[PDB]
Amino acid sequence: GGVMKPHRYRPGTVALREIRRYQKSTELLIRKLPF
DNA sequence: GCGCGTACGTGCGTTTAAGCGGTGCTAGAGCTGTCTACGACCAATTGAGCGGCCTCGGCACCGGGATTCTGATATCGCGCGTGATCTTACG
């Protein structure tokens, strides 16, 4: 008796999700204080 | 198109300095009153750059000759493949 995990995403999908995510917003991306 | 090696994504785990707030100090930014130096302008003066017109040549052109460069070919060289001779093993 063990605990099993459902699945794993194929590569590149989250790349696209991030692409749309950051193409929708406008907030600055580089962190402020190091800059 | 096929095959092989792999850079890196997700995910997890862990770790950390990125933001809020809270206080405290203060630098130079900003706005009044003084004071003064200087650039436009007119007269009058003087002189320099532009254009016309002379003059002359550095370089294009021609022609010829001399020097270089790919493309093709062949030889030397090296490496791979096969048969002859010497060697070793078994029968």
Could you give the CA distance from residue A3 to residue A19 in angstroms, rounded to a whole number? 33
Outline where chain A has alpha helix (H).
Answer: 13-24
Which protein residues, judged by their CB atom, are less than 7 Å from any atom of strand B? A 5, 8-9, 11-15, 31-34
User: Strand B nucleotides below 7 A of a protein CB?
Assistant: 9-12, 17-19
Residue with tokens 């194929």: A10
Which nucleotide is nearest, taking the CA of residue A31 and each C1'?
B18
Find tokens 């800059």 and name the residue: A35
Asked if A29 contacts A22 with a C-beta cutoff of 8 angstroms, the reply is yes
Q: Output the CA torsion sign for A22, A28, A32, A34.
A: positive
Experimental method: cryo-EM
Give the three-state DSSP class for A18: helix
Tracing tokens 């459902």 back to the chain, one arrives at A6
Burial class (CB in 10 A: 0-12, 13-18, 19+), A10: exposed
- Resolution of the PDB structure in angstroms: 2.9
**Distance separating alpha carbons of residues A9 and A20, to the nearest angstrom:** 18
One-letter identity of residue A27:
E
Asked if A23 and A16 count as a contact pair (C-beta separation under 8 A), the reply is no
Give the distance, in angstroms, between the CA of residue A10 and the centroid of all CA atoms in the same chain: 13
Task: Determine the nucleotide nearest to A17 by Cα–C1' distance.
Answer: B9
